[PDB]
Design a protein around this ligand. Structure first.
Ligand code: GTP
Length: 377
């Protein structure tokens, strides 16, 4: 009932918060180390190498927080014209966000904070019209739709439509590695082609266990028929299971059950846009809904790990080195001198212990962050 996407948005705000505190802390600590090293009436209590380390960390953390900021979930769709990739996307959103072709470029869909749809094309910041004015290697058109109308877009998801995998070459995927999920939209009136497989083979080789879903769309055209339906499904199931589990070897048999879905995107869209019956419209709609719920669980989870974990790790290492540096200052300062110099060294002692204690606080919070958002810690 709570969109599983919220898991990603919550992790995002938590990890950006932590890295805010993180940058503040290492900035303060750099000043301290810098003060101590440049103080001319001390003898190497803090060193130039201590200083350079901290300055490096300050600069490193600055732009991690900047890329965390821009991180989002991405799902990419592929299919022959016309298994209905665009109708699948339009139905996940609840409107005809993508009319109606078609043109050789990737089509992504993002949310705007505004109220009006519009377009943008490579190397221009002009917001071109709603889509009306819609139509030398790869071409991307970014479509923007109001967040207030689609929960998916509000919750940090980008959907990408490829041009028909039917119609030319394959150095495409540098639009496509950002993607946390790839979805093959199949034509259930036909059979899984090798041209369809060929693309996901070249995705499998450059990505370790990518998440792949197969939508056998157009599942209307096999309606009306109770016995016929189960027999054709079993046959599509075999080719889909075989492809994922054995050809792509990207998922085991029992997992693959929750990667393959029989669906009617036309129906779902029509039913969803009508909010201001064929044979088995309800069962299919439920099925599209189960897909959404599993998809959202899968993308949110995967996206947190691949986009947030390593930065979390990096932060832990950084906090370790700053603790070692504080300790080193505290200890060096512990080692005859006047009672004027003695209380200067004591001031430095407890400033280092304070700095060191916050580092430990921030390690707590980071640990805390991996428990809530990164099993199995
Ligand atoms: N019968 C059936 N047709 C579908 C379904 N999904 C998409 N289509 C049709 O497949 C054709 C090509 O799919 P799309 O890529 O979605 O085409 P489109 O650009 O949206 O064109 P229109 O939907 O006609 O406006 C269209 O004519 C759709 O009507 C479906 O679930 N069932």
């Amino acid at each position: 009932p709570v969109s599983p996407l919220k898991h990603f948005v919550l992790a995002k705000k938590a990890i950006t918060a932590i890295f805010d505190q993180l940058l503040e802390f290492v900035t303060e600590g750099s000043h301290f180390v810098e003060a101590t090293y440049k103080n001319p009436e001390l003898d190497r209590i803090a060193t130039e190498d201590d200083l350079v380390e901290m300055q490096g960390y300050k600069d490193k953390l600055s732009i991690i927080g900047e890329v965390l900021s821009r991180r989002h979930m991405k799902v990419a769709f592929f299919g022959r014209t016309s298994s209905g990739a665009s109708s699948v996307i339009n139905a996940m959103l609840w409107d005809k966000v993508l009319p109606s072709g078609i043109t050789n470029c990737f089509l992504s869909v993002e949310g705007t904070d505004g109220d009006k749809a519009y377009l943008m094309t490579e190397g221009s910041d002009e917001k071109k019209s709603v889509k009306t004015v819609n139509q030398k290697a790869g071409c991307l058109v970014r479509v923007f739709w109001p967040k207030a109308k689609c929960a998916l877009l509000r919750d940090d998801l980008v959907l990408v439509d490829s041009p028909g995998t039917d119609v030319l070459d394959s150095w495409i995927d540098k639009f496509c590695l950002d993607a946390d999920v790839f979805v093959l939209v199949a034509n259930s009136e036909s059979t899984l082609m090798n041209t369809e497989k060929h693309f996901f083979h070249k995705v499998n080789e450059r990505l370790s266990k990518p998440n792949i879903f197969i939508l056998n769309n157009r599942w209307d055209a096999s309606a009306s028929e109770p016995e016929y339906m189960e027999d054709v499904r079993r046959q599509h199931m075999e080719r889909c299971l075989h492809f994922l589990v054995e050809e792509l070897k990207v998922v085991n048999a029992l997992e693959a059950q929750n990667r393959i879905f029989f669906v009617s995107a036309k129906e779902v869209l029509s039913a969803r846009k009508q909010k201001a019956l064929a044979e088995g419209f309800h069962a299919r709609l439920q099925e599209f809904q189960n897909f959404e719920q599993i998809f959202e669980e899968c993308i949110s989870q995967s996206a947190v790990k691949t986009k947030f974990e390593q930065h979390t790790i990096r932060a832990k290492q950084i906090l370790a080195t700053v603790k070692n540096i504080m300790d080193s200052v505290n200890l060096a300062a512990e080692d005859a001198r006047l009672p004027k110099e003695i209380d200067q060294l004591e001031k430095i002692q407890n400033n280092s212990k304070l700095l060191r204690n916050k580092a430990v606080q921030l390690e707590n919070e980071l640990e805390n962050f991996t428990k809530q958002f990164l099993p199995s810690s």
